[PDB]
Ligand binder design. Sequence first.
Ligand SMILES: Cc1cc2nc3c(=O)[nH]c(=O)nc-3n(C[C@H](O)[C@H](O)[C@H](O)COP(=O)(O)OP(=O)(O)OC[C@H]3O[C@@H](n4cnc5c(N)ncnc54)[C@H](O)[C@@H]3O)c2cc1C
Ligand SMILES: Cc1cc2nc3c(=O)[nH]c(=O)nc-3n(C[C@H](O)[C@H](O)[C@H](O)COP(=O)(O)OP(=O)(O)OC[C@H]3O[C@@H](n4cnc5c(N)ncnc54)[C@H](O)[C@@H]3O)c2cc1C
Ligand SMILES: N=C(Cc1ccc(O)c(O)c1)C(=O)O
Ligand SMILES: N=C(Cc1ccc(O)c(O)c1)C(=O)O
Lengths: 340, 340
Amino acid sequence: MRVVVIGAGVIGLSTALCIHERYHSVLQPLDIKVYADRFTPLTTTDVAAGLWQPYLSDPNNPQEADWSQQTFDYLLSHVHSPNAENLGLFLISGYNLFHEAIPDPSWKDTVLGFRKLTPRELDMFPDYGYGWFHTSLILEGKNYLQWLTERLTERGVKFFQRKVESFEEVAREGADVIVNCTGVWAGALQRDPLLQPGRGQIMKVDAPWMKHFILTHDPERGIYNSPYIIPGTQTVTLGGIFQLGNWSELNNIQDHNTIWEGCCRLEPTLKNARIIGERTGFRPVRPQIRLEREQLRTGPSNTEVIHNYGHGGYGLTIHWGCALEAAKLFGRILEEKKLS
Amino acid sequence: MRVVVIGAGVIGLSTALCIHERYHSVLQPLDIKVYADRFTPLTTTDVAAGLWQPYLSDPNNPQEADWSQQTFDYLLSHVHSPNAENLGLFLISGYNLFHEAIPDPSWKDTVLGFRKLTPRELDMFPDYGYGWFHTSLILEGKNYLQWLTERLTERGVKFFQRKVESFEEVAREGADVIVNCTGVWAGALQRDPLLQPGRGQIMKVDAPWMKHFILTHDPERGIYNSPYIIPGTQTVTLGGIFQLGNWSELNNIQDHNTIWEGCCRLEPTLKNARIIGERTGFRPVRPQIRLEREQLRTGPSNTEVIHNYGHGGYGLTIHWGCALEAAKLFGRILEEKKLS
Ligand SMILES: Cc1cc2nc3c(=O)[nH]c(=O)nc-3n(C[C@H](O)[C@H](O)[C@H](O)COP(=O)(O)OP(=O)(O)OC[C@H]3O[C@@H](n4cnc5c(N)ncnc54)[C@H](O)[C@@H]3O)c2cc1C
Ligand SMILES: Cc1cc2nc3c(=O)[nH]c(=O)nc-3n(C[C@H](O)[C@H](O)[C@H](O)COP(=O)(O)OP(=O)(O)OC[C@H]3O[C@@H](n4cnc5c(N)ncnc54)[C@H](O)[C@@H]3O)c2cc1C
Ligand SMILES: N=C(Cc1ccc(O)c(O)c1)C(=O)O
Ligand SMILES: N=C(Cc1ccc(O)c(O)c1)C(=O)O
């Protein structure tokens, strides 16, 4: 059994991990390879602050709500583990700010200590009028990816830096099963009109007095397009940029100002913050995550493709549930090959 | 009128500030001076985490409840000013842990979003079965004292480094009013069997992923003697040492171990954190705060003395309340002495 995972983001490496640990003992000959065009420093998973928060309203598939819950409980059960720091995992509370009362989210009982904001809190934010507060978790892309790599390496999983042209290419060279975790770039190996880049730009800033996250929502600008501040481990993420269909992997001087202006207004203290760096990333935007099997007619036999992509702006939030599920599907293949 | 403030602690400096700006227009020859033995770098006020939190059970002086109140309100109202980073002001939420279900505090509705810990939160703290969660404030003394200083220097308030031997030494030399803000040392100038040092030892550690304060209460150890973890701006405070009567201004290898074990068990992520610094200090412990007048019979006439000391573990928490009250008592003086 030769498995090939394409993708070295969270989805790729996390899915790689679950399939190993769940099956390395039941399949004496289980060889798992990671093929990636980009690695630990240069993936979308690195631009992300890694704040756990799925969508407010239940999207396309309600099975997604579970995968978040799953990812949350998992991370949560390890917030105090001694390796938490390598994982880049930690707790953070903070604010969700609105202009009008809006229904509680589906995840209200997943996070810790959910509640509405009280008058005095809303006073610190003039432009906003209603909102939530709760404790969540942050999983920073950087450390997590690095930790996944270490686990995977001692696990025998070899890593190769290469660009795949086709599933056929890989199938053609020995793979029984291909786990497809190619993020926003999935289109290149198989057309999918429903996968678009939701371009984002963030600013990293030195402001350690900021201990809470602050997310703003606004229908005039839309999902992920109003100012947000997310204190990270070493730095604070200043963002609020979402542009469907923009493939420009390049920081924009106009986007910069937009980030800076809106976060400064939200939180005046940020005025004297030291700017540490800027990054641009593409959210694998899609109506629903493609987490399903496909059988590609390779020629003699066909090969087994598991897709896992289109995690939107919430891939760190849900990755784990997705990986458990992807492994379930891997399990189903095994039986169907009378070699479980 | 000649004013002399003894003490360059928070109490000292804030009281001089309050008095000045409230009276420099109406008292033409208002010459204020600070006399101190120790300044900004090395006072008790520097050792303080600066976490706003009165005691749980109420104080003798039901006033102290309003003073902390006005302090929180005052600070909370400046948290988003341009100069907040300079004051070392910012918001921080966190836990209070207990063994048994205990009554609510009196300041319950002063802080933002007070509430109880949910079972899932208590699950993160094995050794504790109940507690609260709320959003308080931190005013780090190091920065606060520096800000105060710069205010005062630009208002003409001259500072002198000298150790006062007696109230009369200062009276003898021309001082009309003497503002007595000498902290745990107040007795050296005038006998007070109530004023005592609650020695405290802390540890400054590098752990920027902790964005929550954690305060424990173990009755089999007493107030301030349970482990606590207070994230500051640059560094995290680790503590849990309270010793009534101990005047040893020196770190204790045995007190260190106690800090470090108590805190690692409270939060294991702390085990792989870098120890940046360590300090000792004396909480000016007194059954209640002394804040009142006293006529000094120095000869042909009296000199006025305003005492404002004995703030135990909550000087920062309360300082603004006490300083308003002292400028007030400074007023009474003015009217009686026909000079309003
Ligand atoms: C600005 C910004 C902020 C964000 N903040 C958050 C947040 O707070 N919380 C959150 O949960 N999510 C957040 N996200 C989104 C989250 O980062 C993504 O949904 C998540 O990283 C998706 O994982 P992935 O599929 O990108 O792995 P990817 O990043 O897609 O992995 C891509 C790897 O696949 C490789 N690859 C692709 N195609 C091929 C090919 N044909 N051949 C070889 N290799 C290939 C690439 O080279 C790359 O190495 C944010 C995103 C952005 C842009
Ligand atoms: C470990 C520890 C942690 C603490 N944490 C907190 C906290 O989290 N939150 C909080 O609110 N509080 C905390 N505190 C305590 C709080 O910081 C103090 O109660 C507060 O600083 C009291 O103000 P003050 O009396 O110290 O002014 P001080 O700092 O004590 O005043 C000192 C000045 O008086 C001068 N002086 C005294 N006598 C004379 C003299 N005869 N002649 C000349 N000068 C004289 C000294 O030289 C010095 O300049 C903590 C204390 C400790 C020890
Ligand atoms: N996930 C985020 C952070 C974020 C940003 C804005 C929001 O309204 C929100 O709910 C979350 C992002 O993709 O950037
Ligand atoms: N003021 C603190 C911090 C602290 C420590 C323990 C407590 O129970 C509390 O209310 C506050 C201290 O003096 O140390």
